[PDB]
Amino acid sequence: ARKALIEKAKRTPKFKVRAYTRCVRCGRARSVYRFFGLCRICLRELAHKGQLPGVRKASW
Amino acid sequence: WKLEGELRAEVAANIKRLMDIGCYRGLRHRRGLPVRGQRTRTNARTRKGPRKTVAGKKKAP
Amino acid sequence: GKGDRRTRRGKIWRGTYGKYRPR
Amino acid sequence: EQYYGTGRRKEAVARVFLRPGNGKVTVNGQDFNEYFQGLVRAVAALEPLRAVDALGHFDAYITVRGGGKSGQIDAIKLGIARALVQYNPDYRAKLKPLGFLTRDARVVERKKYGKHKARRAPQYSKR
Amino acid sequence: PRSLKKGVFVDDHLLEKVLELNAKGEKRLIKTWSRRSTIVPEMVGHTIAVYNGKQHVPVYITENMVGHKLGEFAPTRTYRGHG
Amino acid sequence: GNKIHPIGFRLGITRDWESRWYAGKKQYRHLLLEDQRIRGLLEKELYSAGLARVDIERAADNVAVTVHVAKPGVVIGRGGERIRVLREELAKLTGKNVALNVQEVQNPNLSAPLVAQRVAEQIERRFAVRRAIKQAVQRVMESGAKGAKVIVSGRIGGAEQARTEWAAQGRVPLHTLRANIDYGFALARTTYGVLGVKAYIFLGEV
Amino acid sequence: IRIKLRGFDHKTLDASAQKIVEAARRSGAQVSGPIPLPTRVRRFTVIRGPFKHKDSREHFELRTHNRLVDIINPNRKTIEQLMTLDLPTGVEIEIKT
RNA sequence: CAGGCCUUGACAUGCUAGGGAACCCGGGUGAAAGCCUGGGGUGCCCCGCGAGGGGAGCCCUAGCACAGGUGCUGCAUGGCCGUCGUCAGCUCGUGCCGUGAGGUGUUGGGUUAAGUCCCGCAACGAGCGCAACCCCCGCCGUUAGUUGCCAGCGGUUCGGCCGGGCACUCUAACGGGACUGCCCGCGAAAGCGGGAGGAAGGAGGGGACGACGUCUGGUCAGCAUGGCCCUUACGGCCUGGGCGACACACGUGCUACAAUGCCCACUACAAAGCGAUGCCACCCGGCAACGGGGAGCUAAUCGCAAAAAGGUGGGCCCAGUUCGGAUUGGGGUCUGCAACCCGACCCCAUGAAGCCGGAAUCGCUAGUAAUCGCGGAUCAGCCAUGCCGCGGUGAAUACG
Ligand SMILES: [Mg+2]
Ligand SMILES: [Mg+2]
Ligand SMILES: [Mg+2]
Ligand SMILES: [Mg+2]
Ligand SMILES: [Mg+2]
Ligand SMILES: [Mg+2]
Ligand SMILES: [Mg+2]
Ligand SMILES: [Mg+2]
Ligand SMILES: [Mg+2]
Ligand SMILES: [Mg+2]
Ligand SMILES: [Mg+2]
Ligand SMILES: [Mg+2]
Ligand SMILES: [Mg+2]
Ligand SMILES: [Mg+2]
Ligand SMILES: [Mg+2]
Ligand SMILES: [Mg+2]
Ligand SMILES: [Mg+2]
Ligand SMILES: [Mg+2]
Ligand SMILES: [Mg+2]
Ligand SMILES: [Mg+2]
Ligand SMILES: [Mg+2]
Ligand SMILES: [Mg+2]
Ligand SMILES: [Mg+2]
Ligand SMILES: [Mg+2]
Ligand SMILES: [Mg+2]
Ligand SMILES: [Mg+2]
Ligand SMILES: [Mg+2]
Ligand SMILES: [Mg+2]
Ligand SMILES: [Mg+2]
Ligand SMILES: [Mg+2]
Ligand SMILES: [Mg+2]
Ligand SMILES: [Mg+2]
Ligand SMILES: [Mg+2]
Ligand SMILES: [Mg+2]
Ligand SMILES: [Mg+2]
Ligand SMILES: [Mg+2]
Ligand SMILES: [Mg+2]
Ligand SMILES: [Mg+2]
Ligand SMILES: [Mg+2]
Ligand SMILES: [Mg+2]
Ligand SMILES: [Mg+2]
Ligand SMILES: [Mg+2]
Ligand SMILES: [Mg+2]
Ligand SMILES: [Mg+2]
Ligand SMILES: [Mg+2]
Ligand SMILES: [Mg+2]
Ligand SMILES: [Zn+2]
Numbered sequence A: 001a002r003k004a005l006i007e008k009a010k011r012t013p014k015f016k017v018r019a020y021t022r023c024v025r026c027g028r029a030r031s032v033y034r035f036f037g038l039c040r041i042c043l044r045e046l047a048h049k050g051q052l053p054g055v056r057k058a059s060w
Numbered sequence B: 001w002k003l004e005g006e007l008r009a010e011v012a013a014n015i016k017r018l019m020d021i022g023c024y025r026g027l028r029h030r031r032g033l034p035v036r037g038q039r040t041r042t043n044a045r046t047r048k049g050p051r052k053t054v055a056g057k058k059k060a061p
Numbered sequence C: 001g002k003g004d005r006r007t008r009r010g011k012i013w014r015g016t017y018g019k020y021r022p023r
Numbered sequence D: 001e002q003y004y005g006t007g008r009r010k011e012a013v014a015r016v017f018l019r020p021g022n023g024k025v026t027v028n029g030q031d032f033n034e035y036f037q038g039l040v041r042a043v044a045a046l047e048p049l050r051a052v053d054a055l056g057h058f059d060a061y062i063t064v065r066g067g068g069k070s071g072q073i074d075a076i077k078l079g080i081a082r083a084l085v086q087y088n089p090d091y092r093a094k095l096k097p098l099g100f101l102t103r104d105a106r107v108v109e110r111k112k113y114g115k116h117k118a119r120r121a122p123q124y125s126k127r
Numbered sequence E: 001p002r003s004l005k006k007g008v009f010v011d012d013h014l015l016e017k018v019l020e021l022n023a024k025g026e027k028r029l030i031k032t033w034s035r036r037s038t039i040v041p042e043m044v045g046h047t048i049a050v051y052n053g054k055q056h057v058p059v060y061i062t063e064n065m066v067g068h069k070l071g072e073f074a075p076t077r078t079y080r081g082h083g
Numbered sequence F: 001g002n003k004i005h006p007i008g009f010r011l012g013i014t015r016d017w018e019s020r021w022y023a024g025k026k027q028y029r030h031l032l033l034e035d036q037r038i039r040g041l042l043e044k045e046l047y048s049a050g051l052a053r054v055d056i057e058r059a060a061d062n063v064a065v066t067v068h069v070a071k072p073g074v075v076i077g078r079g080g081e082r083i084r085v086l087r088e089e090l091a092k093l094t095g096k097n098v099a100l101n102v103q104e105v106q107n108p109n110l111s112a113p114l115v116a117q118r119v120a121e122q123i124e125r126r127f128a129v130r131r132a133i134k135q136a137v138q139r140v141m142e143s144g145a146k147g148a149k150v151i152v153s154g155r156i157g158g159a160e161q162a163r164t165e166w167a168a169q170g171r172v173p174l175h176t177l178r179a180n181i182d183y184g185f186a187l188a189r190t191t192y193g194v195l196g197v198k199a200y201i202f203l204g205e206v
Numbered sequence G: 001i002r003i004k005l006r007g008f009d010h011k012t013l014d015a016s017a018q019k020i021v022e023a024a025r026r027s028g029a030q031v032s033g034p035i036p037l038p039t040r041v042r043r044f045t046v047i048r049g050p051f052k053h054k055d056s057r058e059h060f061e062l063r064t065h066n067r068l069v070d071i072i073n074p075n076r077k078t079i080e081q082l083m084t085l086d087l088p089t090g091v092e093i094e095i096k097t
Numbered sequence H: 001c002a003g004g005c006c007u008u009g010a011c012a013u014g015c016u017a018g019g020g021a022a023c024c025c026g027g028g029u030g031a032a033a034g035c036c037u038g039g040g041g042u043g044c045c046c047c048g049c050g051a052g053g054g055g056a057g058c059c060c061u062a063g064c065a066c067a068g069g070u071g072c073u074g075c076a077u078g079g080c081c082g083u084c085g086u087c088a089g090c091u092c093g094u095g096c097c098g099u100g101a102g103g104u105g106u107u108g109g110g111u112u113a114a115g116u117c118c119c120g121c122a123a124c125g126a127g128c129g130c131a132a133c134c135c136c137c138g139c140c141g142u143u144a145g146u147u148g149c150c151a152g153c154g155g156u157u158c159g160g161c162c163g164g165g166c167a168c169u170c171u172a173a174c175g176g177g178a179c180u181g182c183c184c185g186c187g188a189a190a191g192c193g194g195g196a197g198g199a200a201g202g203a204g205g206g207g208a209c210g211a212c213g214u215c216u217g218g219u220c221a222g223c224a225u226g227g228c229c230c231u232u233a234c235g236g237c238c239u240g241g242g243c244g245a246c247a248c249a250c251g252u253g254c255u256a257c258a259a260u261g262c263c264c265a266c267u268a269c270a271a272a273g274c275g276a277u278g279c280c281a282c283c284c285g286g287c288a289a290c291g292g293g294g295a296g297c298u299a300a301u302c303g304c305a306a307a308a309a310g311g312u313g314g315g316c317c318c319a320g321u322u323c324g325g326a327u328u329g330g331g332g333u334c335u336g337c338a339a340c341c342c343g344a345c346c347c348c349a350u351g352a353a354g355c356c357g358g359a360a361u362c363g364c365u366a367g368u369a370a371u372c373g374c375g376g377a378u379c380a381g382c383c384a385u386g387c388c389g390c391g392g393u394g395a396a397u398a399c400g
Helices: A003-009 A040-048 B006-020 B024-031 C009-013 D040-044 D071-087 E015-024 F031-047 F070-078 F082-094 F112-124 F128-142 G010-026 G076-081
Strands: A055-057 D004-007 D012-018 D023-027 D058-065 E030-032 E047-050 E056-060 F051-055 F066-069 F101-106 F148-152 F163-170 F180-190 F193-204 G002-008 G031-047 G057-071 G091-095
Touching: A040 A055, A040 G031, A040 G057, B006 B024, D004 D071, D012 D071, D040 D071, E015 E030, E047 F066, F031 F051, F031 F082, F066 F070, F070 F082, F070 F101, F112 F128, F112 F180, F112 F193, F128 F148, F128 F163, F128 F193, F148 G091, G002 G010, G010 G031, G010 G057, G010 G076, G010 G091, G031 G091
Parallel strands: D023 D058, E030 E047, F066 F101
Antiparallel strands: A055 G057, D004 D012, D012 D058, E047 E056, F051 F066, F148 F163, F148 F193, F180 F193, G002 G057, G002 G091, G031 G057
């Protein structure tokens, strides 16, 4: 159960409670950041290659 | 206010009612388990009482 | 104590208000 | 008519103003002994003027913000010290040897991931 | 519980089945997946088959159990005990 | 597995972002999605020309995209033809004015992402994997490079037992911030499984 | 009439603020110099590994740096001059009166 | 998992054939899904006063090619991660030694946090590591002065409120600053001990950074991917159930057993963040959760906001208690299509175990431990006492 799931994610659901986020890159249900529409894993991927504008490795 | 015995009696009738109908809430009172959705894999000692320890599953040699 | 909802300290712990902790 | 020092300790910053007078002090629109009431550590702020017997001579007007009262105390102690050496740099000695010149850089350590606090590690159990 | 500002809840698709019955002269066994429905005074004397997830459990309804949901009388798990 | 990404390690030091715009919470993600959606389309089409770096610049409702390619002639087309069909299909993706650019790669043996795809190609072509690495390292260093390291990991030679092969020449200080290390990764596919090549070029330190 | 600037890099944000300040500086009258507003920082903390390795993370931050500049007296010399100027992609512009 | 359903399929991309295409409205049955259905209308290029007639958007059905699989193998793999370990190490080139594996260098003497340096030497160099370049904190400067600041003036509804100003505080970009630099002493040298200056002295505190490799370590269920396997189903849609079970056993935590405490009232001092079907000032209704109103803010301005421990006053008087707040009865509130299984709150009542914990065992060397509150991400709501962060107060001890 995947392509049907990541696909059903976009389908405007019968109730607005049934709606939920998918990672727009890989289709992960969990740990998805609304700001990016990216899951925590994909976020680290693109960020390390500079493909996340102004997003950089924190250090303090 | 209704107090002491009378209140206890009225509380008793309520629980008794739940059992007799008998909803899931009533069933819980029968077996003396939690009634308000708590987990029973652990804890629940207040309702269940002291631990009745039992043999586990042995390991190989 | 902190686990007592019927007190100021308790409502603080749970981060809520009411009769026992007003705002 | 005035002498200034900038006072800092632990997130707390104090703007101190030393004016000659009876020896009366004020912090943030209310009196000193009113402000640090019931705090035994309060007397430490008015201590660089002891190392130089200016207790009676100066009045002080103080602004304080950030951190806590205890932090604000150490801050005032810095600034009030700084105000005196500005009054006369001959006071630098007999204040520096006692450390009133320096600002301690001790601040809250940053909490680290995989810890409960800064260094407080999660409880170990082998098996 | 459900805020009384809002209405007492039933699925309507089950209520209508009951009301149509009340007219024509009851009864009939009623198959429902609405555990979430509140029991309602018009349901007394009926027997409604609540589905527990596996089977339709026949439930006879009386006045003493009006305020509850239907699912409350069709327990989802079977236990018996241990050992 | 331990080592941090050479690029992500140097963003705002020796490395600038591929996407260089600003946006707010209301629309960071749609802008992000379009960029990615763009890079995908371009990465597959401009494979032949040896796509190396895709830079995307944005203002409002129009977008540039600067492609760095070692063989530009493939990108432009027949007398400025192919750039059109792509910018046509690109604006069809965007809804903006796709100001597609083609920028030259001066020495293609100094582009780590290029070096990677070259070796990956060689190993899909069933070449000697150990030899292929040695040559790639050789060419890179010959091109004036201060240091080179290339790494192949996977079922090398199609062996059942997976392995890791790598060669290196000169300096490659991954710990040094003020050192410009070009990093690139190519995924290589074979009948027996997938390999992975990483190319490291130490262009120089500032 | 004031101009507020935002962007994800402080170097480009300041350059463009420094330029705009200059543009009116030539064509009078007065400018209230580019002041550094506090930086809003958005942080993301993530498990390094893909699977199950909870006690190791990576910290990521996104900084929206902020500058405000005041054009005291309009004077259409400058009020024109800005519309004809080049400031890079990293920055966004707010103009008020 | 049970039950009801779909078969070129929820999805990609080409091919025929037909409707005919669009799309927005419905309606019957049904738990929904689905099945059966009933509306209105499409230019294109065009032959067109015409009857017309077909081309190509996309819809529908039929029929293929194909899709789909979180089904299996982390003992086929990429990628990423844990770990030994921030440990002081692992090697290469040429030379020399050995028949050879290999050795030398990397050993030695001193030094250091360090294969850090110094001296020595058949070795002379070099790379991956260490350190340094990066970030936060501590002092100072420069540049800036609103939404931030108010020292000294003038008003002042007494609130930086207004004129006024950017001194200070701050904000945030660029610099400076410390190098065993200087003095003494011991030293072959490196360094070590000490002193002065100075905000900081011997890496100033903290972070980011993790060598060759190891563990056939972890992940085919994030993704990618070889191979194996399913094809009116191991794919797909839905309704409900389950992941929340409970004689038991373990880990990580929360709240306590009380007077260095508990309570009520009154009164102070943070920081980092978040916020346009969002944060919500203030008004009123409710004991209250909340509800109705209703300004301000696209936010250094408006709001979340009260920080809490503390300080002041009074109460409690050693009691299973005004300690503790589990459990249970009842009545409400809010999100949500819907809180039975299985939400968080509020209120009345209930007021359990617990009197400091057997064998055993954990963390922490300083703004640390302890203790106190605050924010965020995920998110409709929330079972968060979890996690990642932020400040407040602030120890004890290291002989060895
Ligand atoms: Mg998949
Ligand atoms: Mg949801
Ligand atoms: Mg999600
Ligand atoms: Mg349960
Ligand atoms: Mg109490
Ligand atoms: Mg600061
Ligand atoms: Mg703390
Ligand atoms: Mg009726
Ligand atoms: Mg280092
Ligand atoms: Mg084959
Ligand atoms: Mg953990
Ligand atoms: Mg197996
Ligand atoms: Mg493995
Ligand atoms: Mg692996
Ligand atoms: Mg396994
Ligand atoms: Mg085999
Ligand atoms: Mg050799
Ligand atoms: Mg021999
Ligand atoms: Mg020989
Ligand atoms: Mg050798
Ligand atoms: Mg060695
Ligand atoms: Mg050796
Ligand atoms: Mg040796
Ligand atoms: Mg070390
Ligand atoms: Mg030697
Ligand atoms: Mg070294
Ligand atoms: Mg100034
Ligand atoms: Mg294994
Ligand atoms: Mg997979
Ligand atoms: Mg597979
Ligand atoms: Mg379901
Ligand atoms: Mg579970
Ligand atoms: Mg817990
Ligand atoms: Mg939130
Ligand atoms: Mg008792
Ligand atoms: Mg007892
Ligand atoms: Mg009591
Ligand atoms: Mg109840
Ligand atoms: Mg529920
Ligand atoms: Mg006692
Ligand atoms: Mg105790
Ligand atoms: Mg230590
Ligand atoms: Mg406590
Ligand atoms: Mg919290
Ligand atoms: Mg939430
Ligand atoms: Mg719960
Ligand atoms: Zn993802």
